Design a protein around this ligand. Structure first.
Ligand SMILES: Nc1ncnc2c1ncn2[C@@H]1O[C@H](CCl)[C@@H](O)[C@H]1O
Ligand SMILES: Nc1ncnc2c1ncn2[C@@H]1O[C@H](CCl)[C@@H](O)[C@H]1O
Ligand SMILES: Nc1ncnc2c1ncn2[C@@H]1O[C@H](CCl)[C@@H](O)[C@H]1O
Lengths: 268, 268, 266
């Protein structure tokens, strides 16, 4: 019920003052709040990438967090901002364009409102920056003691726009999944294949990558990077419980380029 | 009370330098909240830093110390100044024009040169007045040091100011220039204000003058979503000035333009 | 007490990973102030991380927990350690040399291996000891957990140390090397200390660069020469440096860490 920590994500970058003006607005409304960036380097307009970056935020952040996020190419239109309380007791504020989808998969919506009250907005609201004047402003009002019900009208959880998320499946003689995202600092590849599907099969595994070119590798299944020699490839379960590909102390995607959506098949 | 420090520089955030400044500030003012504006000002680029600070006074609350340095004159006779503005904020930075546009937004009421050793981090290193004078003095002010204790009062006329172009009426339209690029998205921002373009009462001709002329016929829109994806628009930005963009694409990647380029807007 | 956490890693700040670590830390130590040092250490580059931490003890106050990981050994027998230094700061990181130069600045007084499950984020994921051991333990120390509760005491000599080259006197000058590039500006930082160049000044010096001879003025600061002109100076860390006034020295004279620099009188 206290929410003194604001965790802030956007696609505006941190190379100029724009992300910081939003923090200025938030500190003016909630001067005692702690404000921490998640990241401002979501690719421009990339709601799905934003959604992926928020997926694990509910689990890592404590109950007293307001998750404040915008990737908002619909700014100044009928696409409203929503404010949600999740099952962990956190509050989330963002555009109703699918941005909060994967965060809500981790901790479901309990109470959901559209943000329509002028008193939780930064006035006058500029049409090209709902991110500052509605999303950041409303997050700060919630951190400063405003009740969730005062932001605007209640909506049903099914009125929250959801992005589709592919599930891995069993096929003839293995598991077909896909690349969800690249761990870009390192070049590791993250799939949607969970622990339980590869249990049957665990060793040394055939991995088929369908990208610009189709590549078959025979890879050891390891707990961590150091279990093969430097520069050598491995399969492992990542910090999110999903199958991943890497090179020990090198960059897997620089050797075998792959993009999100590319098929990965794992077979004995 | 000024317990919020908003911090700008050109040292980047890719190494420890900007953080050592925060270490010095926390040692002086251990209760202060410190928030970055940005550290990605182009190296030595006082004017770009000044532009990035222009809207900081408006967005940040009255209890802010704006701490900023882009200081190629470090270790020379170019002094640091501390200013109280009409909003009641404090500003600290080199007297080299860096605070010019912030002071245009909220004028100086009181100005001092920072000369007292007791508000500096001793011994002061000649190549980093940003840490040992600007950051240190901002933190002393945040810890409750009176502005008068930093050094002698100076006339606000002795604050170095940067020139800026004004838009004006010409034969059949308004001639301004490109002030900056919204680089995360590729949007173009001009100095042409709302009040001059009273003549949306009715598509407009925009003439961009560089090494070549780019003449476009553009719709005047409230926001990005009012044209199809990839299509160009003219709009009033978050600062109340004419801007150019592509809906969910990058305007300057299609039509390169740089700051200083002339822009005329006229009836078609 | 240690209510300020200063946080470094190699995971970048372009995605949520560094922020999930801060979430874990705020959950353990909700009153803590958390400030990044940087997350842009080059991947797996323990030496670059160690150099970026060198000046942190001196600039940060005694109530700081220095939380740092560059941990390609995650999920192996390479343990995390927690140290109290002579300034009274706490430091947490992998025992892989990362803390070496921070400890040169302010030596270890008490050192423990981090083995207690009660200072870790459970369950500990093998590929992210940085989050589940290093960040979690830093936050428990910031919340007032005694250092002795993290795990068993070790001798200071069991802390892995990275070698660091010393400049020396040779026939008619000083032989040092490039330690790092001040990359925002292109300035070159050497391992030559203030005291070795004091001996040598009459204020013009000759520099021989690895893989060029320059005759350079020794200046207090950049603005003592015209814009675009080269200078020698003592940097903010008390070491000899090379720069161009309002330009990029390494873009004109490329030099990499480990390249020899010899300084001799005119
Ligand atoms: N040219 C453009 N087209 C569409 N949307 C744009 C834009 N420039 C910024 N934004 C969008 O403006 C939002 C602030 Cl509310 C950001 O999250 C960004 O997605
Ligand atoms: N090579 C160089 N020439 C002139 N100024 C320089 C420099 N390297 C860093 N600074 C300047 O040192 C300041 C710290 Cl006080 C920064 O703001 C930066 O502008
Ligand atoms: N492909 C890879 N090889 C070796 N180590 C890797 C890696 N990807 C991430 N890390 C390492 O995982 C640590 C988190 Cl504990 C980071 O500090 C990073 O150094």
């Amino acid at each position: 019920m206290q929410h003194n920590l604001i965790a802030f994500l956007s696609d505006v970058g941190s190379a100029d003052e724009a992300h910081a003006l939003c923090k200025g607005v938030m500190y003016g409304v909630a001067p005692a709040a702690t404000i921490v960036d998640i990241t401002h380097d979501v690719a421009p307009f990339d709601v799905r990438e934003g959604a992926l970056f928020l997926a694990d935020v509910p689990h890592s952040f404590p109950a007293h967090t307001v998750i404040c996020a915008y990737v908002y190419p619909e700014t100044g239109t009928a696409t409203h901002t929503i404010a949600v309380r999740n099952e962990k007791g956190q509050l989330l504020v963002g555009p109703n364009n699918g941005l909060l989808s994967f965060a809500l998969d981790a901790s479901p919506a309990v109470e959901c409102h559209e943000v329509l009250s002028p008193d939780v907005m930064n006035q006058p609201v500029t049409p090209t920056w709902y991110g500052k004047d509605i999303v950041a402003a409303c997050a700060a009002h919630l951190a400063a003691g405003t009740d969730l019900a005062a932001v605007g009208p209640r909506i049903d959880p099914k009125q929250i726009v959801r992005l589709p998320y592919a599930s891995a499946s069993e096929v003839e003689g293995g598991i077909r999944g896909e690349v969800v995202r690249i761990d870009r600092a390192f070049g590791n590849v993250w799939t949607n294949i969970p622990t339980h599907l590869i249990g049957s099969m665990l060793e040394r595994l055939e991995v088929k990558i369908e990208a610009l070119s189709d590549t078959v590798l025979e890879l050891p299944f390891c707990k961590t990077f150091g279990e093969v020699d430097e520069g050598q490839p491995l399969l492992y379960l990542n910090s999110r419980g999903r199958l991943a590909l890497g090179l020990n102390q090198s960059n897997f995607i620089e050797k075998w380029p792959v993009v999100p959506g590319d098929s990965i098949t794992v077979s004995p």
